[PDB]
Amino acid sequence: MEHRAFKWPQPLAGNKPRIWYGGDYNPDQWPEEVWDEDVALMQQAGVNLVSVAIFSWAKLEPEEGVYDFDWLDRVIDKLGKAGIAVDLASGTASPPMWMTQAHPEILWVDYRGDVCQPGARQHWRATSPVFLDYALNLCRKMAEHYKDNPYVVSWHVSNEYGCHNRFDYSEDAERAFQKWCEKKYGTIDAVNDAWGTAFWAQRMNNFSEIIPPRFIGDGNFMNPGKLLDWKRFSSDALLDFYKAERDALLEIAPKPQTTNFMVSAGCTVLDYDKWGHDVDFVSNDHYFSPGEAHFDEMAYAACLTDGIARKNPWFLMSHSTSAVNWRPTNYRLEPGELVRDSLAHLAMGADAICYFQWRQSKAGAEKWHSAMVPHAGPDSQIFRDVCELGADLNKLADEGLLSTKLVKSKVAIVFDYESQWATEHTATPTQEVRHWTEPLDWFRALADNGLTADVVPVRGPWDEYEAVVLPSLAILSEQTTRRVREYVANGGKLFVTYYTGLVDDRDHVWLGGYPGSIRDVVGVRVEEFAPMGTDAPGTMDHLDLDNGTVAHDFADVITSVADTAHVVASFKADKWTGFDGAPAITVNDFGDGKAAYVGARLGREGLAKSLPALLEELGIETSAEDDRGEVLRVERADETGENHFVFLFNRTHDVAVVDVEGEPLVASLAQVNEHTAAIQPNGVLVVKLAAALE
Amino acid sequence: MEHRAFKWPQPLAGNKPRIWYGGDYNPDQWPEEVWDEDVALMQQAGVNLVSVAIFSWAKLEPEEGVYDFDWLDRVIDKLGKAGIAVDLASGTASPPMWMTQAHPEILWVDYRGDVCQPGARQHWRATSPVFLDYALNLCRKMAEHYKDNPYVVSWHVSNEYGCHNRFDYSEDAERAFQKWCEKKYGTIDAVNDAWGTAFWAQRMNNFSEIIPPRFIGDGNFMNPGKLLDWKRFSSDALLDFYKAERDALLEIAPKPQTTNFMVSAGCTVLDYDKWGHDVDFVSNDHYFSPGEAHFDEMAYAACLTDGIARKNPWFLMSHSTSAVNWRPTNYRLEPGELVRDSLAHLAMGADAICYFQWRQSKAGAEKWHSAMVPHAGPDSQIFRDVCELGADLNKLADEGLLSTKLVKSKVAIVFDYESQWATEHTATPTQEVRHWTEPLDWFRALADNGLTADVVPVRGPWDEYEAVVLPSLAILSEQTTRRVREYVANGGKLFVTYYTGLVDDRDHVWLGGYPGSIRDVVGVRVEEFAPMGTDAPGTMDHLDLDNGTVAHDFADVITSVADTAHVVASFKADKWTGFDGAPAITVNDFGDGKAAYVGARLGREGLAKSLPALLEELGIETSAEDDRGEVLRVERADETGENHFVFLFNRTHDVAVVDVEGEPLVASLAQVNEHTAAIQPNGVLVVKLAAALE
Ligand SMILES: CC(=O)N[C@H]1[C@H](O[C@H]2[C@@H](O)[C@@H](CO)O[C@@H](O[C@H]3[C@H](O)[C@@H](O)[C@H](O)O[C@@H]3CO)[C@@H]2O)O[C@H](CO)[C@@H](O)[C@@H]1O[C@@H]1O[C@H](CO)[C@H](O)[C@H](O)[C@H]1O
Ligand SMILES: CC(=O)N[C@H]1[C@H](O[C@H]2[C@@H](O)[C@@H](CO)O[C@@H](O[C@H]3[C@H](O)[C@@H](O)[C@H](O)O[C@@H]3CO)[C@@H]2O)O[C@H](CO)[C@@H](O)[C@@H]1O[C@@H]1O[C@H](CO)[C@H](O)[C@H](O)[C@H]1O
């Protein structure tokens, strides 16, 4: 509750505002003579900001209490003198070897008591008082040294908290988890009650009896209430460390500050919407998913970023020019995708576009990760494309893109980090169902029907939207249950799926029939589930619906439908399953609103096909056109609507022709005409609308 | 050698004998006001026994030397006053947190020296003298308190020994394994000889040099003799703990006592047939396997339970109303299956039918496991079905089912826990072959041919049967070899498969040609094996036989056939494999008997098709009808045969019509006529035969 005031990295003295463009720069990894070439190439590419010193601790503090800043003063001076701004890191992302050799108590400990060693990065415990002292000291030294530097426009505090150190099981974590439980519950009776410890003789007499969820034998079942709280605690322990580092910097050197998130459809290492309350601006690292979901999942993640940002501008701190280096198979980007993907984030509300990283490493663990200047060097398709992007972004700022905001959708898809965590336990109805996939499925299926959804975290203002999707939203607290009931009562249009509202925020089941807190709203009562799969011969692996769709993985057993509701689709099945003729999809009237219930996993394709009848019943208007789905349309506008941009992205492997409605500004793999344009696969067109017209 | 005298939980004062019906009850997990509702619902459902206090240690002994019995006196009083009996637990199944915090030496240790922590259940070492002292103390306190309680009719000692703590590698286990080896072998020379330690420089000078089979590098090969003995020792160490707990209870409070087994086709955590010698009555927990084997594997496991029970009545301590919560995908039961599955166990000789559990948990690790009263509550298909079952079981006891016994089959399928263990080593001909699958395959294939097999442990009286199957029975001791030779000599009909009699009880190979101890009996000599699979391109993955069947995974290389034998089926293969025309299935004459040899894995379907010619040759008579296989017929009768029941179960997804031969008593998804009945998929009919008729 409560965001910090929005702050943004400001232009250097004498510059106009720009879409910030550039990325991580690691000059410490090259001979100094390379730095003049870097700068010349950056000017060519239109680069205007770089992120420096992110893992430079071992250079800045080469041994305890010895500081070496001169190389970085020098780099920062050459950048600034060329008009390139610096987003400066704290430098505290990962500790040097001298530190972990003197203080092995810093290193995080795994569920079995094995100590993560140096050799990669981020091997520190979030609750180490010793690592905290080291970090805050370096933050103070950096702040003191760079506080009156005019080329430094922002702090980049640490890097991707929890990417490697989400979980620690040390004695430090044990003591901190105990204190976090006492602060959250007050008494051990309220912990026993929250975690349901009357089973398996788990009841505790005092706080000292709370241990971390350490090794219990592989395959055995941890207490779910406790594991959910362990995840909340791990997120909060890292957030407290961020806050301390932030506050140490800001007290000496008050500049716009952020830390880079890892928002993507499937990453929930942290409750990023909570974290969004502690940053001045939201910044995000996102790397494409391979294959057919590349475009859609990226637009989704960018959308959720914007939703975390409460529609404020946000900063894309990283993405790749082409391949990453950490998947089993590191696919390259296809032609056009470098520009398209950058513009996808821009469309969804970013006012900074940055890459990991500027110059591709020639040695170390990152050498095979793509860069803005590849091994090949500047004479490459990649660097030319980087240059073209630089020019596109200068153009879009010249035409007024800056501080426009992602337009308000008709539909808010709700997302809850905590509901995901809840669905991750091993003793749920099926390991094939998690929260995270369903909102992405709804985003894509709505796209197929010509509608661009907003993705809104559960804390944010989804109840202001024309329609709302609760997508496998396993947790509904008392508070959220009330928000839902009121939302619908007062004219809302609600879609609710299987695996919604199973439990409260303690992972206590809502009894009486699922979804046990909102049966009245949805007008159905579910008695049990029917998971599906192919784990043994003869298992039930699908259910047909009578609207021509197929359910996989999970279906609800709906045994009553209220009088104020009706059935829109029914399962068709072999008689012995009990599903022949059972209700699959319903719609209910509730006060002035409506709620549809989708009682099974239909996937993108099933939902896409199911949606027309449901959009019609709920009075949600969309384009009628056959080619509706071919292109994702994304809009930004200022509050007045006089600067309005539309970004059009082909989602397909066919040429998409579209009615073009304003002035074309940027075209990648697209040709304009007569208000027509043909967009090649992986193509994008961006248009500025004339405010005096339609 | 030597069973205890059979004892059975007796009716409460003023009741007649009943099929015990109910399950685990955990009132400690609900507010006390719920207990009056539980009791009212139990009466409605026909519930007449519940199992209480199984994991209640942390409530009964909330801290060391403080006892709190009053809540359970109260619950037991309300149950008893409503006519519901209590199967009372020892309460010692899993220790409280205060205990493991004071005494971490209690916790079991894994192969790598990592200590299993509290967080789930049963984290105690079988050979901890300290955990033993705690357990026996609580057993004495419970026995003393409940010894003159008339509503307590049995002891339920601990719960599922070895489900989580089968293996411990602590210093306690090291010392105990040393003593178990000395007690078994007498001298270190006899251990060296048993384990074959002259390879890999493993020879030991004394007992102190025997360590547990701890971590040797993942992928490396433990000594097989030793690992087999480790498994026997782990089973015996838990059995000694059971015996001590039992004897501590019984000395103060002599009531019928059991501990719940985990008999299923594939579970061999313990030598359950040995354990069967130490219980007063056999009790079993069994949860359905998903997909097409659900019915058959359950009938098998129930059958093996009965065989462990030496045809005495046995107690089904647990099974599920619908889904469990511990598989990757927790399928629900289909309509009818709740009643059908319960009656399957009943048919195979159970005189008690109980579920985990009475009321579905609303919190903790078990919340998604089905119950008799689901989250949904009593207004559910599940609770109605539980009520219908209650009524069916009252009816069947009124008609005389109690203490009838599962009829003697023509065929005994032999099962050996130890042979399974032997086949589990990593350096066998193939990891795709284990003992356990073959007896289940034979049970199903015989069912397909209209015969209901008995499953008889190797120690029991299989040599009294008309026919006997040795199914991948890898171990044949000197003693069992002699029993087999005599059995056949004297008129027995024997089926022997691939992977039988490879080794003696020390895992020493019988030399000269497999199966090296009974070549004379089976009239074949095998020189080597041909495992099969798809592990690389071009591997041999099957062999056709000339009776229209296909072998997969394993075939024997038979190189001679005795004069008293002939070949019934031959492989057909590409010439270069060497299998074209080689013998696959033989029959031999040996004294007055016969032995068939099935020299490959044919599966249920191959064996089913192979069986007519083999049943004909061995003079085993079966129904001739085409629809033979559609229904499993299972019979119980008293010694006189004047109370005779027949249970008929559809195995198929078609409607099965059957000739009905007595008075119909219970019908689920079946309709009776003219002595005809039509049984729907998942249906069952139970009939009492008129003793004066056919
Ligand atoms: C944003 C990002 O990807 N950064 C990391 C990368 O992140 C992965 C980890 O957080 C793991 C930990 O659970 O989860 C991955 O997300 C999963 C998600 O958990 C699944 O549910 C879902 O289905 O799939 C996604 C993956 O698609 C995170 O994405 O981890 C790699 C490997 O450690 C890092 O290399 C990467 O950070 C970047 O590394 C670059 C190369 O070394 C640069 O260091 C750059 O500074 C970083 O942004
Ligand atoms: C009878 C039963 O299933 N009880 C346990 C369950 O048992 C499994 C374990 O013993 C593991 C250990 O090896 O083996 C499983 O059997 C395997 C077998 O080993 C394989 O060869 C074969 O192919 O598959 C079977 C599985 O189908 C045992 O079945 O383990 C679960 C998970 O730990 C327990 O939840 C279950 O006990 C019941 O748990 C309920 C829910 O918490 C209640 O506590 C109830 O009291 C228990 O009966």
Author numbering:
A (entry chain A), B (entry chain A): 1 to 673, 676 to 696
What did the publication describing this PDB structure actually write?
Aim: Bifidobacterium longum subsp. infantis uses a glycoside hydrolase (GH) family 42 β-galactosidase (BiBga42A) for hydrolyzing lacto-N-tetraose (LNT), which is the most abundant core structure of human milk oligosaccharides (HMOs). As such, BiBga42A represents one of the pivotal enzymes underpinning the symbiosis between bifidobacteria and breastfed infants. BiBga42A has a three-dimensional structure similar to other GH42 enzymes that have three domains consisting of a (β/α)8 barrel (domain A), an α/β fold (domain B), and an anti-parallel β-sandwich (domain C). Glu-160 and Glu-318 in BiBga42A were predicted to be the acid/base catalyst and the nucleophile, respectively, based on previous studies of GH42 enzymes and sequence alignment.
As a result, the lowest activity was detected for the E318S mutant. An LNT-complexed crystal was indeed obtained for the mutant, and the structure was determined at 2.2 Å resolution (E318S-LNT). The asymmetric unit of the E318S-LNT crystal contained two molecules (chains A and B) of BiBga42A, and they are virtually the same (Cα RMSD = 0.106 Å). The electron density map of LNT was clearly visible at the active site. The pyranose sugar ring of the Gal moiety in subsite -1 adopts a slightly distorted conformation toward OH5, and the C6 hydroxymethyl group takes a gg rotamer conformation. The carboxyl group of Glu-160 is suitably poised for proton donation to the leaving group as it is located 3.3 Å from the glycosidic bond oxygen of the LNB (Galβ1-3GlcNAc) unit in LNT. The C1 atom of the Gal moiety at subsite -1 in E318S-LNT has moved away from the side chain of Ser-318 with a distance of 6.2 Å. In addition, the C1 atom was located 4.3 Å from the nearest side chain oxygen atom (Oε1) of the superimposed Glu-318 of WT-GOL, and the configuration was not suitable for the in-line nucleophilic attack to the anomeric carbon. These observations might suggest that LNT was bound in a catalytically incompetent mode in the structure. The sugar ring of the GlcNAc in subsite +1 forms a stacking interaction with the side chain of Trp-326. The nitrogen atom of the N-acetyl group is recognized by a direct hydrogen bond with the carboxyl group of Glu-160 (the catalytic acid/base).
